[PDB]
Amino acid sequence: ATKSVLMLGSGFVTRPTLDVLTDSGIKVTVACRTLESAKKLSAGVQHSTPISLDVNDDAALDAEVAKHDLVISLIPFHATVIKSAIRQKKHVVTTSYVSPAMMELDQAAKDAGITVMNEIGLDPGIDHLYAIKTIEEVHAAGGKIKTFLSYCGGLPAPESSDNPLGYKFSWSSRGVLLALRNAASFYKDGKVTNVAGPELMATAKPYFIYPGFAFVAYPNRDSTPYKERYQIPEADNIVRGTLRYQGFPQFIKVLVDIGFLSDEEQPFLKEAIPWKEATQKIVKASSASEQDIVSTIVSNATFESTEEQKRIVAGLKWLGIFSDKKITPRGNALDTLCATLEEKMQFEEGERDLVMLQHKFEIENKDGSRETRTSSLCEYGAPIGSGGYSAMAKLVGVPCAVAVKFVLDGTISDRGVLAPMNSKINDPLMKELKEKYGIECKEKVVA
Amino acid sequence: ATKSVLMLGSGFVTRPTLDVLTDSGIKVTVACRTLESAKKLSAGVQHSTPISLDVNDDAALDAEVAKHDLVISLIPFHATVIKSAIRQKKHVVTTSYVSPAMMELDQAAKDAGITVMNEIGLDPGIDHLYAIKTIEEVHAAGGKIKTFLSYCGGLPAPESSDNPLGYKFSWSSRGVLLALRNAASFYKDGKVTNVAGPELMATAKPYFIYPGFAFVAYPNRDSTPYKERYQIPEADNIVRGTLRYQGFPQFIKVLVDIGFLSDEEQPFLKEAIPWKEATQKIVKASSASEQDIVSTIVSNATFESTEEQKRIVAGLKWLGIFSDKKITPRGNALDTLCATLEEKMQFEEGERDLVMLQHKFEIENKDGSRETRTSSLCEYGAPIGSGGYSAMAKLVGVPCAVAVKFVLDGTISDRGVLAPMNSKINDPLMKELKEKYGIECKEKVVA
Numbered sequence: 001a002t003k004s005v006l007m008l009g010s011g012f013v014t015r016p017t018l019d020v021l022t023d024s025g026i027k028v029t030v031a032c033r034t035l036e037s038a039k040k041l042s043a044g045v046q047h048s049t050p051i052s053l054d055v056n057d058d059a060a061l062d063a064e065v066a067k068h069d070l071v072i073s074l075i076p077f078h079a080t081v082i083k084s085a086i087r088q089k090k091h092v093v094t095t096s097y098v099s100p101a102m103m104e105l106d107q108a109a110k111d112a113g114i115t116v117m118n119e120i121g122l123d124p125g126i127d128h129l130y131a132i133k134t135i136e137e138v139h140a141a142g143g144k145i146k147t148f149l150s151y152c153g154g155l156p157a158p159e160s161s162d163n164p165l166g167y168k169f170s171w172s173s174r175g176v177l178l179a180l181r182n183a184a185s186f187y188k189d190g191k192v193t194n195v196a197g198p199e200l201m202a203t204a205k206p207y208f209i210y211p212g213f214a215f216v217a218y219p220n221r222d223s224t225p226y227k228e229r230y231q232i233p234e235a236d237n238i239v240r241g242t243l244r245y246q247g248f249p250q251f252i253k254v255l256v257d258i259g260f261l262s263d264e265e266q267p268f269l270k271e272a273i274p275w276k277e278a279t280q281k282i283v284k285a286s287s288a289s290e291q292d293i294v295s296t297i298v299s300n301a302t303f304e305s306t307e308e309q310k311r312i313v314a315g316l317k318w319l320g321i322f323s324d325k326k327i328t329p330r331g332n333a334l335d336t337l338c339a340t341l342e343e344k345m346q347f348e349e350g351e352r353d354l355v356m357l358q359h360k361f362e363i364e365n366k367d368g369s370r371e372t373r374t375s376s377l378c379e380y381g382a383p384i385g386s387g388g389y390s391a392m393a394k395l396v397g398v399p400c401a402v403a404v405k406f407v408l409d410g411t412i413s414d415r416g417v418l419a420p421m422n423s424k425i426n427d428p429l430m431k432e433l434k435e436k437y438g439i440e441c442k443e444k445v446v447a
Numbered sequence: 448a449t450k451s452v453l454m455l456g457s458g459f460v461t462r463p464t465l466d467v468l469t470d471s472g473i474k475v476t477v478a479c480r481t482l483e484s485a486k487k488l489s490a491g492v493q494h495s496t497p498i499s500l501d502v503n504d505d506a507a508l509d510a511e512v513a514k515h516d517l518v519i520s521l522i523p524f525h526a527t528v529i530k531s532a533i534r535q536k537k538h539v540v541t542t543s544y545v546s547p548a549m550m551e552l553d554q555a556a557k558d559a560g561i562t563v564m565n566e567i568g569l570d571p572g573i574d575h576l577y578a579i580k581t582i583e584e585v586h587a588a589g590g591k592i593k594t595f596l597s598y599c600g601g602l603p604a605p606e607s608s609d610n611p612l613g614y615k616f617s618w619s620s621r622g623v624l625l626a627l628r629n630a631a632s633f634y635k636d637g638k639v640t641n642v643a644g645p646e647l648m649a650t651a652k653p654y655f656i657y658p659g660f661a662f663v664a665y666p667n668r669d670s671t672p673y674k675e676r677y678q679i680p681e682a683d684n685i686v687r688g689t690l691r692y693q694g695f696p697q698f699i700k701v702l703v704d705i706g707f708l709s710d711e712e713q714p715f716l717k718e719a720i721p722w723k724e725a726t727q728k729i730v731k732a733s734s735a736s737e738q739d740i741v742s743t744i745v746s747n748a749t750f751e752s753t754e755e756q757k758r759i760v761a762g763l764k765w766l767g768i769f770s771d772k773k774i775t776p777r778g779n780a781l782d783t784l785c786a787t788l789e790e791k792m793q794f795e796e797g798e799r800d801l802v803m804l805q806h807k808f809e810i811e812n813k814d815g816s817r818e819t820r821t822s823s824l825c826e827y828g829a830p831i832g833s834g835g836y837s838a839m840a841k842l843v844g845v846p847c848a849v850a851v852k853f854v855l856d857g858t859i860s861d862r863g864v865l866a867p868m869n870s871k872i873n874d875p876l877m878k879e880l881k882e883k884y885g886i887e888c889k890e891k892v893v894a
Contacts, residue, residue: 158660
């Protein structure tokens with residue numbers, strides 16, 4: 001009964017998932033575009049095998065999928081992976097949202113007799129388990145969920161947050177930045193509300209959680225489907241979003257107004273030219289001198305105060321965009337900036353990760369009374385270089401590994417395209433995560 | 448040349464100091480009022496000896512002081528200890544401020560040929576070393592210190608800060624609370640300014656340091672002497688104070704207005720009566736019901752918003768002052784409350800400590816230009832129960848241990864009552880702390 005799994009992905013989360021599975025006697029073949037990449041994320045790990053595989057090659061994917069009992073997709077390609085799993089009749093586990101194309105394969109998945117478990121990372125994943133656990137507790141008590149809010153963020157521990165964005169990139173900064181262009185839809189005062197663009201960041205206000213942290217919160221993706229998903233018809237306000245630290249909204253805006261986020265390719269950004277010229281050109285400065293560039297930046301951009309302005313300007317200088325530092329030529333203002341962002345804002349040795357996840361429920365009790373309850377999870381990662389897991393890697397990778405084990409042993413047996421949307425699936429998942437890994441959200445009241 | 452030291456104190460900081468000294472071959476006799484207390488803080492530690500000693504007994508103190516080469520005072524008794532050291536001609540090291548009574552013994556200390564090194568903990572101590580290092584660097588460059596600000600705080604790591612005050616007591620909460628009554632004096636716009644009482648907390652505004660933290664800052668003790676001590680005659684603003692987290696100023700005020708900080712002993716607070724009655728009595732409530740007590744509390748106290756009010760009220764309830772929980776009878780409202788505070792707000796297993804120290808200098812450069820520079824130190828302690836040091840214990844205890852070693856080997860040879868107020872003393876201290884323990888403040892510019 002030695003089960004084997006095909007793991008797709010050459011990223012952050014792969015390790016914890018790999019460790020947990022192999023530690024359980026489950027064999028895992030790690031597939032990346034490159035053999036090196038796979039060799040890396042698998043060196044020294046028992047029961048693992050690295051290979052080069054082109055996931056977009058339908059014929060090649062099917063051949064490899066058939067050799068295992070389940071395929072794990074931690075990569076970007078989801079429907080394609082599911083279609084192969086359907087042809088080969090193997091199960092699937094992903095940490096991504098169920099998209100329209102994935103749901104479209106629901107019936108075909110059921111006919112092939114396979115389970116496609118999605119949204120079982122940190123968020124989506126752990127957040128679903130505890131949001132639903134609490135909602136059902138409330139409802140069981142005859143209470144009403146009038147407002148449901150959920151915010152989550154993978155950030156630098158405060159200790160190591162001293163950079164312009166109070167943020168450290170693990171994945172492409174280009175992706176993070178462009179994502180801020182996406183529209184967010186949610187329920188407010190009982191009505192569907194849409195927000196995007198500067199407006200999104202202009203709405204990112206301070207959001208209290210614990211005294212020691214200074215978070216700001218904003219809507220992310222589509223929250224409207226949850227009135228149905230979490231069965232909270234009585235909810236007037238439903239919002240799922242992300243957490244950032246104070247100052248993030250403001251530095252992002254300046255980068256925008258300065259035009260550094262332009263996707264446009266410039267002929268003058270093809271060679272390693274000093275940062276000075278780049279910015280002076282991108283900004284429209286009379287010269288490459290700090291004075292001029294800075295005077296153009298401020299005179300055109302609006303700030304909250306002289307101090308914020310002073311701070312944001314020093315932040316820009318800190319990036320090195322006003323220096324003799326040659327650029328990492330990428331043709332795009334955004335791309336070029338991102339290269340430097342990557343270099344200047346990464347987690348370094350000894351630094352720690354931080355995950356904050358908090359659901360908030362304003363409740364109207366059976367007795368007519370009211371109360372506000374929270375369900376929170378706050379965890380720090382192990383220092384870089386210590387060999388331990390970052391908080392993000394652990395909280396995404398372990399839930400995924402647990403789901404994989406449950407689909408393989410039958411604990412999760414529903415066929416089709418699924419998400420952790422009910423106690424039949426969620427209870428076993430929460431019990432294993434908490435009892436075996438100490439992973440859980442704790443409840444508390446306020447109001 | 449086997450030196451020996453008499454260590455006075457049965458507290459938090461004793462361990463790191465003890466460990467460092469004994470690890471250096473220095474014998475230490477740990478003295479506490481109780482032999483048990485001493486036996487505790489010394490069990491299993493090589494080259495240490497515990498004893499019972501009454502520091503207030505002049506004859507007893509002299510006898511013991513004479514048996515060692517130096518006396519370390521980490522206890523509350525300073526002048527008394529110094530007088531004994533003067534009679535016995537032994538050296539002294541303390542982590543406290545040089546008081547008028549201590550300075551009065553300066554000449555007598557010099558005549559006895561001894562060194563009395565004070566203010567060598569974290570704050571006072573490390574803060575002095577780096578404030579002076581930076582000021583001299585600036586002055587060397589011909590710059591002017593127009594404003595000097597320094598704030599420091601020993602707090603719960605954000606992760607474990609979720610309590611009404613965003614604070615955890617290591618030492619008596621009664622002391623902490625009463626200290627908020629002390630007047631703070633500092634320089635503002637070139638003039639001596641005094642602040643105390645509600646005013647002190649009403650002035651505790653948000654103070655930005657790093658994006659991830661939400662600190663508030665306020666003046667502490669006497670900063671005026673520093674215009675001379677740090678030789679910054681050109682400074683218009685000189686302020687040394689403490690850091691707390693957001694919300695601290697507000698919860699303290701409610702406790703005040705509710706009268707919970709009254710020193711008055713009540714005949715009804717002599718027996719273990721349920722918290723309900725206590726508060727209802729102390730507050731002046733129509734009943735011991737949450738409604739009444741809460742209605743009296745709010746109707747009389749003013750808040751920033753309904754939400755803050757809601758939050759602060761839930762915080763009070765969290766303390767258990769509205770419950771059937773019997774009180775730990777202490778006659779005083781403050782004392783009784785403190786017993787519960789002690790119990791509810793302590794560092795527990797797995798929890799981490801946090802020390803934030805930051806000097807800020809607004810400078811006018813030789814070129815007439817201006818700049819703002821900071822010197823910071825941010826450190827987390829080891830989880831309670833892990834056996835490692837808390838940040839506070841390490842940062843107070845290690846600097847002290849280093850000073851002790853320097854007075855014993857001659858590195859610090861000036862006689863009299865001293866403080867780390869110059870490079871002759873400060874440089875060796877900073878070098879050892881940074882090179883051997885990695886303890887230091889890092890500089891950065893802004894503006």
